Structures are given as structure tokens and as C-alpha cells.
Paper text:
Collagen's structure involves the assembly of three polyproline II helices, with each individual chain consisting of a three residue repeat sequence with the general form (Glycine–Xaa–Yaa). The triple helix is stabilized by the backbone NH groups of the Gly residues acting as hydrogen bond donors to the carbonyl oxygen of Xaa position residues in neighboring chains. To gain atomic level insight into these new rules we present two high-resolution crystal structures of collagen triple helices, with the first peptoid-containing collagen peptide structure.
We solved the structure of CMP 24, bearing the Xaa position Val residue, with the sequence [H–(POG)2(PRG)(POG)2(VOG)(POG)2(BrF–OG)(POG)–NH2] to 1.25 Å resolution. For one CMP we included a 4-bromophenylalanine (BrF) residue for phasing using single-wavelength anomalous diffraction, but molecular replacement was successful for both structures. In the structure with the Xaa position Val residue, a void is present along the surface of the triple helix at the site of Val incorporation. This is a result of Val's secondary backbone amine being sterically unencumbered compared to the tertiary backbone amine of N-substituted residues like Pro, Hyp, or peptoids. Importantly, this water is also positioned in close proximity with the Cα of the Gly residue adjacent to the Xaa Val approximately 3.3 Å away. This Gly Cα corresponds to the azGly substitution site in our model system. In addition, we have reported two new collagen crystal structures, with the first structure of a collagen triple helix containing a peptoid residue. These structures, containing either a Val or NmetG residue in the Xaa position and reveal how the NmetG residues protect the collagen backbone from solvent while the Val residues expose it.
Author numbering:
A (entry chain A), B (entry chain B), C (entry chain C): 1 to 30
The structure:
Amino acid sequence: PPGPPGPRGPPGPPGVPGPPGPPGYPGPPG
Amino acid sequence: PPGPPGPRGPPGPPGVPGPPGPPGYPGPPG
Amino acid sequence: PPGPPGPRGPPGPPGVPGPPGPPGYPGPPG
């Protein structure tokens, strides 16, 4: 009958880059 | 002959942090 | 004998959102 399963495979690739952050705060009064 | 391939590896690390957001809106008029 | 290593894991989660962008420019003069 078949031999034992092999070792676990390696870790996956990193996820995709995160989303751009939100807009910054409004500038100061002119 | 060799047994079955091992189990699939774990999920990878998180992706790189996202870029900084767009510049904020201009301030109010002086 | 034991099988070959398993397949590579799935991708990690998406990166975190970036930080808020730079502050806006100063408003126009009154």
C-alpha cells in the first residue's frame, strides 16, 4: 500500500500590497 | 514508490502596507 | 517511503491600508 504523505509544503507568497491610505487633513486657513 | 505529496503549506505573510493617501484638500480662504 | 513536500501555500492577506496622505496646502488669502 502507499507510503506516508510527504511533509507540509512551504509558506505561501506574501499578500498583495495594501490600499492607498485616506486623503490627508485639509490645509491651514489662508 | 514514494507516498502522496504532503499537505499544502500555510498562507503567506501579509502584503506590504499600502502607500500614503492623497494630499488633503486646500484649507479655507483667509 | 514518504511522499514529496506538499504544494506551496496560498497568498497571505492584503497589506494594511496606508497612512493618511500629506496635509493640504494652505487656503487662498482673504
